[PDB]
Design a protein around this nucleic acid. Structure first.
Ligand code: MG
Ligand code: MG
Lengths: 235, 239
DNA sequence: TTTTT
DNA sequence: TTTTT
């Protein structure tokens, strides 16, 4: 099974899972965006298909009362940011078309984030993947607390459109790279959903995996054992 | 077991991190470190106290069948200004010591305003549900936290809530409670409520009625799916 | 290659 | 009945 290949190293969680052609997604009825998406890449799999034949549409195999709509994002000020990236899925027109499901979208800052630094992170994972045995990428939104002036910690985020789609404060990305058979490089990033200077290197957004777990309420690469991790966030 | 099937007869609100305790079912949210929902089932017979039971020798503690890193602890609540508010109320579970002890799992707790809410109007709503249930054949109650949007001083909508303790336990902005009362066999009265997690003044609990649909949308849950609307004879006091 | 009323 | 040192 493709899906069982994609999810070899663990399910981050089991809420409202859909297995699409080339990735697995978990959808959150409350925020109207994904809990997470998992992707599996090989050099083989990263190689006629056109993407502007694609239009974002709701995945209606989820109940309608829990759907986002293009009308939620329209004039929001945010892009429809695709967590499982179209560029990662080009072995078929279907596979790429499903990356355009709104279940796979989060409201993302456009210029200075989704169109730049977040895009740079995606391109980095793709390029590293092209010279690795297997690559596993888990992406998801976050809603992080901030201490404010009264000394109290608050989670605050905008919601948009009539369906109140959540605007994540941050996004995480965790990549597992099989370098030598049975052995892995692990890269864990948290980036703010905000304008980021192009000056900043992606490694500045490294965080320990445990931080991603706690913040997202997910078990990332549980089925995997830490002996087989040879490199962690560069080290 | 067969008990959990009686409890969940009219459907699962969701399937995330479900635990079946002896007399109620709970769904646990790893992000908020509190419940998504709890579902309870009462009857007049089950509201008779059993002998030897006692709620005085009960202490709040985590349910460690969830992974440690997603638990809340008593230290998260300690000196926060909020109560450990039981969603499935101790008072609903009368038939054994374990059944009531389990309502003291922290998975069943939300940070709640005490004076003016948990100890007052929220408790008034709980007692009201037990009272109605002594006169009904079957009663199902679904309870949970909400985190609701507020139009701020720009023109943008925001969800904002406090998190407490080192584990960042969410302080809900509101709580819903939906009660399905079987008034005659196969015929139900439905009552849906949303209250703010705040001091509530004289205010009748019926001021907090909202359509079921509004609770489903806010909570991202499917409440009482296996219930045919033909069978509903009353909705928040009407019809 | 990422997207926008 | 609810809870908190
Ligand atoms: Mg993107
Ligand atoms: Mg209480």
């Amino acid at each position: 099974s493709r899906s069982a290949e994609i999810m070899k190293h663990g399910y981050p969680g089991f809420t409202n899972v859909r297995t699409y052609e080339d990735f697995v997604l978990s959808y959150d009825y409350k925020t109207r965006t994904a809990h997470w998406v998992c992707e599996h890449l090989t050099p083989e799999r990263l190689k006629g298909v056109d993407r502007k034949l694609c239009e974002a549409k709701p995945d209606i195999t989820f109940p309608q009362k829990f759907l986002s709509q293009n009308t939620d994002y329209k004039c929001s000020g945010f892009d429809r940011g695709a967590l499982a990236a179209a560029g990662n899925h080009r072995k078929s027109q279907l596979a790429v078309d499903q990356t355009f499901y709104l279940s796979n979208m989060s409201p993302q800052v456009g210029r200075g984030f989704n169109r730049d630094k977040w895009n740079d992170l995606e391109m980095h994972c793709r390029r590293v993947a092209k010279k690795m045995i297997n690559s596993y990428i888990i992406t998801g939104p976050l809603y992080l607390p901030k201490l404010e002036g009264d000394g109290k910690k608050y989670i605050k985020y905008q919601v948009i459109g009539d369906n109140n789609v959540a605007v994540p404060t941050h996004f995480f990305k965790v990549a597992l790279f099989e370098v030598t058979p049975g052995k892995f490089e692990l890269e864990s990033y948290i980036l703010p959903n905000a304008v980021i200077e192009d000056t900043v290197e992606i490694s500045k957004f490294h965080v320990p995996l445990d931080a991603v777990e706690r913040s997202a309420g997910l078990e990332i690469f549980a089925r995997l054992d830490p002996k087989s991790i040879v490199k962690e966030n560069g080290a």
